[PDB]
Paper text:
The human proteome comprises 266 human PDZ (PSD95/DLG1/ZO1) domains 16 and about 4000 putative PBMs, defining a network of one million potential interactions. PBMs are mostly (though not exclusively) C-terminal, with their COO- implicated in binding, and are classified based on position −2, being respectively Ser/Thr, hydrophobic or acidic in classes 1, 2, and 3 17,18. PDZ-PBM interactions are rather transient and promiscuous. Viral proteins bearing functional PBMs are found notably in HPV and HTLV oncoviruses as well as in HBV, WNV and coronaviruses including MERS or SARS-CoV213,15,23–26.
Residue numbers in the entry:
A (entry chain A): 6 to 422
B (entry chain B): 731 to 735
């Protein structure tokens, strides 16, 4: 999913300074228990920007040959402030090279935003509305292509595409289409905002989003949430949850989980496993903060190994331990989180099965998963679904939904099996 | 707390 490259960058400090900011240190950890020094910002027309090599999110390994390993924040700052005007940096980059490789919806190769916008306008305005054409277009374009369509639509009609579709569509189909027209962060932010109703908060939707999104996704959600609603996501969580459930949700929503490490820390894997047992099944009652700290701070690959080592000590695996130890929203949040850590595509496959298996449909959950995972890991979700349930995700959608709504969801599924 | 350099 990611690539790591190292590189020596040589900067000359000009009248505007080096032109970048840093975070980190043993006392100001960027992510949980990470003491590294990271570039947080790069100023324009500064030395780093005009050089081009340094990038935000870079880890700074050394300055003028001095290693930035396990330093106080101030000691790293002092090494920069006491450097000369010729500054040599060894830096580590982190590059994401996955994209939509495991998504079911790909960018349409022969895309033409103006053509799509015109054909959707025509479909909206034909007598009776041509929902088939609207579904065929919008579910067979990537999210960013949909944004270009919406821009071209507004330019030619002087009306917003989402407003026009609110009038042209109804029912679950409208929910699907309007969801697809939001960016991933806008969609997640709006779903979280809608779930927070004070004492009527939709904990299940809160849990699903907060427990399953990564650091990078949550950082974008936090930024977009603030722009859209003029309040920080964390503040709305605090005012709409309570108890240990609130502390868990707040911790997860920060999106500061330890990032994937190069070295597997076997000693910490074992110690975390013992701690989880000692805090839960081994004792009367539960030390919930210890569970929260471990499960929100460690990297996902680390915790995967922790949960297996936990079985060496405990007669019960982590999931059945949660069921035995806690109840209510807190129990449901831990259960979702542990499933997300162990196998995220299987987590979504099981949530999709649950949304359809019984009487009627939990359309809110079904739609949200099909919209939000279609460009992420729907191909992996489909593989886990077929392996566990024998029939395909496509088949269950077909049995539980009908009409143009069904057709849109099957396009988001992408194919059978 | 970020530090400008
Ligand atoms: Ca129609
Ligand atoms: Ca409507
Ligand atoms: Ca116990
Ligand atoms: Ca059903």
């Amino acid at each position: 999913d990611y690539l790591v490259t190292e590189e020596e960058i040589n900067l000359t400090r000009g009248p505007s300074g080096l032109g970048f900011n840093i975070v980190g240190g043993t006392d100001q950890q960027y992510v949980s228990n990470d003491s590294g020094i990271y570039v947080s910002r790069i100023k324009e027309n500064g030395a780093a920007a005009l050089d081009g090599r340094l990038q935000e999110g870079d880890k700074i390994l050394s300055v003028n040959g001095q290693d930035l390993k396990n330093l106080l924040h101030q000691d790293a700052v002092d090494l920069f402030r006491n450097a000369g005007y010729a500054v040599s940096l060894r830096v580590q980059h982190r590059l994401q090279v996955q994209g939509s490789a495991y998504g079911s919806v790909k960018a349409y190769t022969n895309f033409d935003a103006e053509r799509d916008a015109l054909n959707i306008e025509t479909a909206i305005k034909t007598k009776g509305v041509d929902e088939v054409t609207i579904v065929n277009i919008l579910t067979n374009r990537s999210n960013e292509q949909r944004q270009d369509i919406a821009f071209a639509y507004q330019r030619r009609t002087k009306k917003e595409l989402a407003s026009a579709l609110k009038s042209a569509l109804s029912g679950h189909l409208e929910t699907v289409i309007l969801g697809l027209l939001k960016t991933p962060a806008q969609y997640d932010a709006s779903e979280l905002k809608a779930s927070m109703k004070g004492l009527g908060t939709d904990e299940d939707s809160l849990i699903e989003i907060i427990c399953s999104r990564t650091n990078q996704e949550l950082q974008e959600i936090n930024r977009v949430y603030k722009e859209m609603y003029k309040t920080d996501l964390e503040k709305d969580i605090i005012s709409d949850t309570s108890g240990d459930f609130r502390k868990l949700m707040v911790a997860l929503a920060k999106g500061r989980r330890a990032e994937d490490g190069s070295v597997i820390d076997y000693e910490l894997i074992d110690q975390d496993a013992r701690d989880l047992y000692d805090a839960g099944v081994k004792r009367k009652g539960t030390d919930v903060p210890k569970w929260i700290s471990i499960m929100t701070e460690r990297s996902v690959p680390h915790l995967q190994k922790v949960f297996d080592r936990y079985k060496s000590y405990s007669p019960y695996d982590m999931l059945e331990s949660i069921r035995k130890e806690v109840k209510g929203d807190l129990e449901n949040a831990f259960l979702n989180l542990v499933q997300c850590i162990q196998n995220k595509p299987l987590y979504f496959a099981d949530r999709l099965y649950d949304s359809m298996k019984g009487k009627g449909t939990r359309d809110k959950v079904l739609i949200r998963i099909m919209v939000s995972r279609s460009e992420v890991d729907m191909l992996k979700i489909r593989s886990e679904f077929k392996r566990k349930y024998g029939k395909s995700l496509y088949y269950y959608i077909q049995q539980d939904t009908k009409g143009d709504y069904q057709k849109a969801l099957l396009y988001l599924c992408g194919g059978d099996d | 707390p970020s530090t400008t350099l």
